[PDB]
Amino acid sequence: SLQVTLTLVCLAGLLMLLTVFGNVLVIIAVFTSRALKAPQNLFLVSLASADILVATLVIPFSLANEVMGYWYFGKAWCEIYLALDVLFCTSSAWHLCAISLDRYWSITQAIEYNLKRTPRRIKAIIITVWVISAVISFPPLISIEPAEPRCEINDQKWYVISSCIGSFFAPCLIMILVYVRIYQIAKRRTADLEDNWETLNDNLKVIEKADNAAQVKDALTKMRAAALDAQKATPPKLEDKSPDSPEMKDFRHGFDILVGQIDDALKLANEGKVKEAQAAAEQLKTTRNAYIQKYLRQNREKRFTFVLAVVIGVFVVCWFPFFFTYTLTAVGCSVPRTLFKFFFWFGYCNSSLNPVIYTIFNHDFRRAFKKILCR
Numbered sequence: 001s002l003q004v005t006l007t008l009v010c011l012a013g014l015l016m017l018l019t020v021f022g023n024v025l026v027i028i029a030v031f032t033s034r035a036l037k038a039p040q041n042l043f044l045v046s047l048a049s050a051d052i053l054v055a056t057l058v059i060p061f062s063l064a065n066e067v068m069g070y071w072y073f074g075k076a077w078c079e080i081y082l083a084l085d086v087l088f089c090t091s092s093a094w095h096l097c098a099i100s101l102d103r104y105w106s107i108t109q110a111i112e113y114n115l116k117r118t119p120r121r122i123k124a125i126i127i128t129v130w131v132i133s134a135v136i137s138f139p140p141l142i143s144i145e146p147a148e149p150r151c152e153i154n155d156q157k158w159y160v161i162s163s164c165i166g167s168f169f170a171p172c173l174i175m176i177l178v179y180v181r182i183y184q185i186a187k188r189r190t191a192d193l194e195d196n197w198e199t200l201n202d203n204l205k206v207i208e209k210a211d212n213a214a215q216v217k218d219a220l221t222k223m224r225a226a227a228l229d230a231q232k233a234t235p236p237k238l239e240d241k242s243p244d245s246p247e248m249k250d251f252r253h254g255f256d257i258l259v260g261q262i263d264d265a266l267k268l269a270n271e272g273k274v275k276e277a278q279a280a281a282e283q284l285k286t287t288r289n290a291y292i293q294k295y296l297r298q299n300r301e302k303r304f305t306f307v308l309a310v311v312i313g314v315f316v317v318c319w320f321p322f323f324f325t326y327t328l329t330a331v332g333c334s335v336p337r338t339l340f341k342f343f344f345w346f347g348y349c350n351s352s353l354n355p356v357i358y359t360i361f362n363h364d365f366r367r368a369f370k371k372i373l374c375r
Ligand SMILES: CCS(=O)(=O)N1CCC[C@@H]2CN3CCc4cc(OC)ccc4[C@@H]3C[C@@H]21
Pocket: 062, 082, 085, 086, 089, 090, 151, 152, 153, 163, 164, 167, 168, 344
């Protein structure tokens, strides 16, 4: 059917190998670590097990129907083929939605939800998501469309809408509405410390380009107020630490040292020694960066929620134009055949793009993959 064929099937086999290899590496990395992975990561193996299931049981049949024609072998072929092909996409979307709800509840109610985060509760959520995904994916007896039954799903004007908002749109909307609240909560929690940090930076730049003792003295006084205010804050890395913790003591003592160096710089500035005060300002800038800047980072939980956020973003980016045009055809809109094919082709390669996100943005997953590969 195509001018060249071996190139496309080698491409698809390359894609299937990447999906299987990456997702089975994720599953092994999650299950083999000695208390390094939590039950809240059980969803990551279900989403991974779905990606493997979509690489060995979904994309090869579509590849064959694309090159050799839609030669489905039996009516049960298109039946289970379209059923599992929609089930895996629906289960992936609802798994991402349940993950976003898991992060939201773990943030809002730490102690309470941590007590209800048992592996039994997580396994029950996974089974429930799989069950409701199989229910939503199952159509009301309108299966497809047995001599030459091309695996082309039915396109009812009022079934396309139900299936799309039941699989993609509702989970994506809910998970987006969840992560925007996660983003707002994080920024509201770090706003005051970021304000004090930006005040310290602006007054340091003022002293950098200052030319008289009045400017540097004023900036140092405002820095003293900013440093004392930031000292009473809780940095993002130490968000779950005690006041007697050595890092919290180091954070407090670091701003104590910064205030002391500001007092010394003010003693220099009041004597008219502008250049000496500016040099002391550069020294306390380095001291502040060396003492505090490591605590401005997020903890492991916040970094992983960001990783799951960009995973949701990749999932939406891969599947949105497909559902968008597939819904547009229901209300009377024209789309090219090759373009309409490549739109869900972007959704297929999401299964292989999912494991590599962990290697890019996470250090534990990348270390576990390196450990499995090296030894
Ligand atoms: C040519 C008819 S098709 O275009 O329908 N073709 C049938 C074979 C499988 C192909 C890829 N799968 C990806 C998952 C998916 C989910 C849907 O709702 C969630 C709806 C369709 C599909 C498509 C159908 C597509």
